[PDB]
């Protein structure tokens, strides 16, 4: 817990003035560019490629979990979360009276006192609930985990005696029930704070009503900012009951708890909320934000976003015979085969390296991509063909495919490439130099100039000029290279 | 929302000692009841200088928080007040000496000194009103804002009743007569804290059994109004025809003592036009009609249109703004929107949302015409029918509405957010287009410093076109070094 | 009842150290020596006899309220209250987190090897509930009220932000149920603390199961020292659940809340709890203290307790022709008349004194006492005869009987007293003598010498005595009267 | 208790090598060193001597609840409990994942002909059982809530999801029904894990066989380690069936359920198991332990255990007039009246101290011991006389006697000690008067003159003059008072 003494700032908005829970948050000015400052990528040096195959394979296997590239939706979602969190605190000011007394005083002052008019609207504050919908693998969880890391989870105050829980995350389990969510709420709260609410409130004897009341009480004890319930797809409609009962429980939970609630799910989870979204009555809530794959055709032009994403990842290939330019057909094949879904796009790039490391030459070709698509990514065929077809019901049915058990498959592929003793000509050429630190110059000089006299002339020149930097001897080698 | 009751007197002699009527906000004149509904956004000059995404969000937040009270809301407010306060006169629970009074009256009529007597005042008048008008005219927001003045639940200390003042129901997209009964309980256990839906809304019950169960509950808490919204959405095939809906809506008024209000589209009146059972019961208190705004009702143009357009125009967030609104712009709005409330606001919002994307940042007639042509496609026949003026064509296309407008707003925001990136770096690489140059830059990015590396090589390429990449390396390296 | 800033003193006991809650309580040593100093009495003056009938009747009317004699059981109950209140704060010291961290730390330290052994004994200190059983009218409620008034109800901590509630009391009503107990807890908490919890939690939606959890959370929030449920005899038996459901509810309430709990009831309510405390299990809790009537005899001798109580009550005689000392016959018949019940002992005396004053033959004797017994105590005959019979089963059935509506009878008898106008010979002499000092002399010398020479001699003597007090005047009149 | 997170420690035995359940338990200890870990005593021995009598009585009443001293027979029981708990976990190893491949490889090799013999799997047969027999009052439960108090009850495993219930304790009922033994298992498992087994299984109408086949399924999901059944005497043909089914139920239970079972009973409960070789084979599966009272001497010289038990308890004496050392006559009388039963030794001490406080004598002699033995220990006399006799049959027939309701006697004695009175000097000065005349004169002349010399003057008036009437005495009394 980043327990920091509450240091209070000045906010431009008059509504957020003198609220001790909002000045404790990081300022907006530094959060303007923090949304776009989420970029993170691996750093590669020249000597990494010259090293042995095991470390190169390890670095290749480290790619999927160490690469992030933000998009426009990562900015829109960041701004939405910031405004939601900062607007959900306006009603819960400890320095001002509660809502019910305000309403009662207004009623007395409009009937007995002097006041021309009043608005008996719910003072519950904004509390804008939201529902995030997207196909599996689009990159929803990995975006929440990166845009919710700016705010510290727990902030401690000293003028009062409270502990502010800025956000809380609940992750569902497969084939769970409604009561499992209630248990997980207390479990996550005890993990975050270090309390013992689970023992005295998370017993299995309690009914749903008692657990909901206790959740409301405890969430109003510690000032809670946001509640995120992830992976709604795993809930089962057999034991829980009808889909109407699930919606009733979700609406009851949202109304009682009194804090902003965000739900993340797939289109298969939309059939539960279909009746709620279409109704236009205020108070139903659950605004919808849809995550979509990167469509290459916008306004009759290739996307600058698509090429920007592909070029950066194309710069991150560890190949001996790699092609610097990404051709139009090479760009098009691994879009038309993967349909732009976020995980499959990087899955091809990480798996084609492994396939090429054993199947022959170290070059990425369309045939190799087709072969890896056909032999490895078997379960995800219906989802990809549904996305290619473009019929919404077909995509809705064939979603949730997550190509199970890729973690063990990566390890098995690593073990498979581990037991290879054949020597490539490139390995022989690299071994012909005894770590003289000159295979780097040889690397820039191998793609065009022939190797008939490349290495002997290089060795002769570096022997003639023993102690200078490689930048100095590169013109020296080039002087007699063509003469 | 549990508000304790505070009693105040009213000048009406018919409501002398009624707690239900005396625990309500006081009676008001014409000016305040119509001027209390006004609401608008407040903007500051600091909002003008901000990032484009926040400005787009503020623009998209306009239709939710803007309301202008016209001259047709005063009548609706007055009628709703009369309906709510007049339906409680026969339901006051203060009956202290009824038994002795009735017994004395009976003992006196038998002897012969008293000719006649009235044992029970059967105050059971069925009051109702139906409000029909074209879609997009604002029958839902104009009702929410009127009803947001009374408290919903009032608690009386002396008694044990919870006076649920009003209740609102919305119909489903296909809909049947059973689901209205199922939604009554589902909204009543949301207004209060209860579990009526599981206890009473079973499947074993028929339509009549739930219709009779609703009466006991609506008389347990002194319900004051019942609003059924969007009767246009009901399907005439899953309900029983065009007659069993009318029978349902006429039997509903008689048994349930509360006043009811029915809201629909002009093509949904064909259900209700068959008989007096809703031409008299439904129009037991009139039938208010909503119409689009007319530009020139008299010889002079209407001041309502001018005031509405001016007040809408004063919420513009653009660097290049024109304070004076041109007459041609007014003509363009009246020609494209034809006075429908839902079209004017969307046209304005979409125009000033596309202005940021195109970068002009000024609203012109051509932009409004283009956004009307591009975005308002499904609602064209309704506009044409309103322009023609034939009642049948107006009735037939009265249910048109543009689908998926919110997704369009989100996509329009995303396009601007993608555009916003200035990209000060990589500008020289944008200037770099030749394949040989890009390969050379990739080769020499680590060796040299790119900032002065990129511009220099373009001159060398421009001077001598008939040179290859391989042979250019020594000369380019020599020029870079010295 | 009013907020008091906490003042931290020092306690000599080692276990009650560094605890904000215990040190803020009143000091232990001062309370020890003042446990038997709660004795109160309605003081009388020598001049009170000389005033009229109405004023003296009004003065006699105040005896049942302005009198309290501390008996043996009062000290034991005081000690039990003290230990129960101050022993339940050991496990809730704010300086240390809780016992779970202690248990985990001990487990880790014994697993590592630095600690030989650890006792997972579930340390809870005393943590014992108490059950009070006694016949109606024994005087439990008054003693409890007078012993709980020493501790201030609410003390405010400024260094912390908690509201210590030292005790809380709940009073039942006729034919009540459990939900009234749950709601009355909140109502009493609002009346004592000064905030509004009834309007937020007193909702008809909640069942009793959820209300108990809310009670537990709120009580743990405020550090509730002690909970006293009173007059459980009044609530109906079969209206709620019968016998098993009420016992189950009481056990659940005792287990969940975690603060000391006391119950007060009649022997007729003991059969609810007979199934629990009779089992030979010292860890089941529910210790019992039995209240018993005062016994005249002890190991063959009259106990000093009853004799001292009767003497102190007889010291307050206010009557015209009353006797001086207490006779053996009247004292012995008083035991058969009242049988030791606290209410009957004082009420018989008050009623007999009032009747003697009203009759005009004011001298309380055995016959007047018996007449009052058979006149006013008709309803409570079965309880008295069952208690005198000594059958342990019949006393339980009639233990709930109580004298109905006696307050109105006192007013009616006072109105009857005000109606009389006849003048007794003592009142005739009172009208004859103007000086109150002379009236006292007449009163003390009334029985030895009759008014044949009494009134004239003292009248002329005090008339001729110009100005002097009684101290030397009385000896001077003695020889003149004797001559 | 409570969900303690597991921390693994290695075990030196080869067979316990890789079992999480065995490793999460507290480390192995030597038998001699483990028996000394059970000792406990009161810490208030000298600091609390000078205080009021009721507080001292309240302190004394807690001697038989917090004083425990191990004997030489506890180390064997501790070793047996440890071996029984840890040795029943070898067949329940959860951490195995290479079974399928190994079994299939063995099958292939034995089918081809490379390998001759193989062993696939074997089921477990029977669980260890133990029997403990001894007379009542010997300490078979106080000495076993402390052996099992050095273990956690519930342990949570992070990598798995099992909650290892280390042990569980249930008691038989007076009815002896076989359906209330399968119904306390669920209740005791619910009172520890906070689960809902009793509603799901017990309340439905199931046969004893079906409900016994469900007790071995929830004792496997939670890796239960030991099951203790107390008061096994109550199945001696008490009710509910015939002897043959009552004997078949235990055999089927031991055969079915996988956990070890321990049985505790009275010397009249070996007739149940001494009926056929199956019952005596299963009751004495891991030895049988028979317990006997303490003897004064074994071979000539007196027992040292008696000396150590009657010397570490005599120190806990809160009396002003105590003796430093034990007179041998007092100890001999104590052994004559106690005969070695654990319960009688403590009670003859606490009751003697309470009577000493009540009567005002602050020292303990043999007379008080004999008086308490004759008065307050009537119901257990046949057992003590049979033990003194020496005939084994009379000892065996009276091994079930127990004294009921001694806590009520303790409370009554505390009340008697509380009600002693203070004898304030003014009341005793008034009590010095021995006639109605002196009291009459004092009451007549109390207010006029000071009471500092009133009593001596009145006493001297009657002392100097033998007797004469009060009316003429009063002029002399006032003359003496004035001068
Ligand atoms: N904007 C992005 N830039 C780079 N990689 C991304 C991006 N979004 C998602 N990914 C990759 O997609 C992979 C899988 O995403 P995942 O968290 O499984 O999405 P979901 O939880 O919706 O299935 C992650 O390993 C992550 O590296
Ligand atoms: N008087 C008004 N002033 C401003 N906006 C209005 C007014 N009346 C309606 N609107 C706009 O019309 C939009 C839709 O109206 P709605 O209530 O949906 O009408 P209907 O229910 O008949 O379709 C609302 O977003 C609201 O902003
Ligand atoms: N020690 C005492 N001295 C004087 N009066 C007493 C004493 N104990 C009880 N009383 C009398 O008992 C009455 C109250 O009895 P109460 O406590 O209500 O009995 P219960 O609790 O059984 O209903 C008071 O009016 C009081 O005068
Ligand atoms: N080793 C011991 N030291 C001191 N007291 C003991 C010891 N063993 C037993 N006792 C006493 O024996 C009393 C009764 O034991 P109990 O649990 O009733 O055994 P059982 O149930 O076999 O009769 C307890 O109060 C306890 O104080
Ligand atoms: Mg996910
Ligand atoms: Mg509408
Ligand atoms: Mg009472
Ligand atoms: Mg026992």
From Swiss-Prot, chain B:
One of its GO terms (molecular function) is DNA binding. Keywords: ATP-binding, DNA recombination, DNA-binding, Nucleotide-binding, Plasmid, Transposable element, Transposition. TnsC binds non-specifically to DNA in the presence of ATP. It is required for Tn7 transposition. Monomer. Interacts (via C-terminus) with TnsA; this interaction allows TnsA to bind donor DNA. It comes from the Bacteria. Residues 385-404 bind DNA. One of its GO terms (biological process) is DNA recombination. ATP binds at residues 133-140. This is Transposon Tn7 transposition protein TnsC. The gene is tnsC. The keyword ATP-binding applies.
């Amino acid at each position: 817990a980043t327990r920091i003494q509450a240091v209070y700032r000045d906010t431009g908005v008059e509504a957020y003035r003198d609220n001790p829970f909002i000045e404790a948050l990081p300022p907006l000015q530094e959060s303007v560019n923090s949304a776009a400052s989420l970029k993170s990528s691996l750093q590669l040096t020249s000597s990494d490629l010259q090293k042995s195959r095991v470390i190169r394979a390890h670095t290749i296997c480290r790619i999927p979990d160490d690469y992030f590239q933000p998009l426009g939706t990562h900015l829109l979602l960041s701004e939405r979360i910031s405004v939601m969190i900062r607007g959900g605190y306006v009603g819960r000011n400890p320095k001002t009276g509660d809502l019910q007394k305000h309403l009662q005083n207004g009623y007395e002052r409009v009937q007995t006192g002097e006041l021309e008019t009043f608005r008996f609207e719910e003072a519950r504050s904004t509390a804008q609930s939201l529902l995030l919908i997207g196909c599996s693998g689009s990159g929803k969880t990995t975006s929440l985990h990166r845009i919710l890391a700016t705010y510290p989870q727990v902030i401690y105050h000293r003028e009062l005696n409270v502990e502010q829980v800025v956000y809380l995350k609940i992750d569902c389990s497969h084939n769970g029930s409604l009561k499992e969510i209630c248990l997980n709420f207390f479990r996550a709260l005890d993990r975050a704070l270090g309390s013992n609410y689970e023992r005295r409130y998370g017993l299995k004897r309690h009914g749903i009503e008692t657990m909901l009341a206790l959740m409301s009480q405890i969430a109003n004890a510690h000032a809670l900012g946001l509640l995120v319930i992830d992976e709604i797809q795993h809930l089962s409609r057999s034991r829980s009951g009808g889909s109407q009962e699930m919606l009733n429980f979700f609406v009851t939970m949202v109304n009682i708890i009194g804090v902003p609630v965000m739900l993340i799910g797939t289109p298969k989870a939309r059939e539960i909320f279909e009746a709620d979204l279409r109704s236009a009555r205020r108070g139903a809530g659950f605004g919808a934000i849809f995550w979509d794959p990167i469509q290459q055709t916008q306004r009759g032009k290739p996307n600058q976003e698509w090429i920007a994403f592909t070029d950066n990842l194309w710069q991150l290939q560890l190949l001996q015979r790699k092609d610097a330019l990404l051709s139009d057909e090479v760009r098009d094949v691994w879009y038309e085969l993967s349909q732009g879904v976020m995980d499959i796009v990087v899955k091809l790039f990480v798996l084609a390296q492994l396939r090429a490391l054993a199947l022959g030459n170290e070059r990425i070709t369309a045939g190799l991509l087709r072969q890896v698509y056909q032999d490895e990514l078997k379960p995800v065929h219906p989802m990809l063909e549904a996305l290619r077809s473009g019929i919404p019901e077909r995509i809705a049915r064939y979603s949730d495919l997550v190509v199970p058990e890729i973690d063990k498959r990566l390890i098995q592929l690593q073990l498979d490439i581990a037991a290879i003793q054949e020597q490539t000509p490139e390995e022989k050429a690299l071994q012909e130099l005894d770590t003289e630190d000159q295979r780097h110059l040889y690397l820039m000089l191998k793609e065009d100039y022939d190797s008939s006299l490349l290495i002997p002339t290089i060795k002769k020149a570096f022997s003639q000029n023993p102690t200078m930097t490689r930048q100095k001897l590169l013109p020296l080698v080039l002087q007699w290279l063509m003469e």
